[PDB]
Amino acid sequence: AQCSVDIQGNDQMQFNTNAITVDKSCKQFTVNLSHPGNLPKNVMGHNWVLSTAADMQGVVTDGMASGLDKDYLKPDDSRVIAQTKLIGSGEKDSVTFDVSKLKEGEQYMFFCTFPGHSALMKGTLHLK
Ligand SMILES: [Cu+2]
């Protein structure tokens, strides 16, 4: 079975995937984030952060306030289910989390927390 997805965040402030449906049989799910292009993390950093649909705005806003040195995320934010590092061009990072953290009927959102990125960067996630 497929329990992984490869996602790219580029210099155009776009994710190449904006919808992920996780199979219920998967024990763990993996997101492999990469950054093709030429721009560094201080100006075009991208992360893949997962929260419930209701918690998205709060994670993004409190993330902007945390700054670059904290990867634009409130440290150990309880609303964050899974997160990758903030990556620049030529860098990559993967995050694997337990599918038991996802509930039937609940809606999740994945997004980048770099200031302003979430306007285009993102997508929906839920159990298949
Ligand atoms: Cu970004």
Swiss-Prot record:
Q: Name one GO cellular component term.
A: plasma membrane
Q: Which domain of life is it from?
A: Bacteria
List the keywords (alphabetical). Copper, Disulfide bond, Electron transport, Metal-binding, Periplasm, Signal, Transport
Which Cys-Cys disulphide bridges does the record give? C3-C26
- Pfam families per the UniProt record, alphabetical: Copper-bind
Q: Which InterPro entries match?
A: Azurin, BlueCu_1, BlueCu_1_BS, Cu-binding_ET, Cupredoxin
Residues the entry annotates as binding Cu cation = H46, C112, H117, M121
Query: Known PROSITE patterns for this protein?
Result: COPPER_BLUE
GO terms assigned for molecular function:
copper ion binding; electron transfer activity; identical protein binding; transition metal ion binding; zinc ion binding
Question: What does this protein's UniProt record list under function?
Answer: Transfers electrons from cytochrome c551 to cytochrome oxidase.
Could you tell me what this protein is called?
Azurin
The record lists the organism as Pseudomonas aeruginosa (strain ATCC 15692 / DSM 22644 / CIP 104116 / JCM 14847 / LMG 12228 / 1C / PRS 101 / PAO1)
Q: What is the lineage of its organism?
A: Bacteria, Pseudomonadati, Pseudomonadota, Gammaproteobacteria, Pseudomonadales
User: What gene is this protein a product of?
Assistant: azu
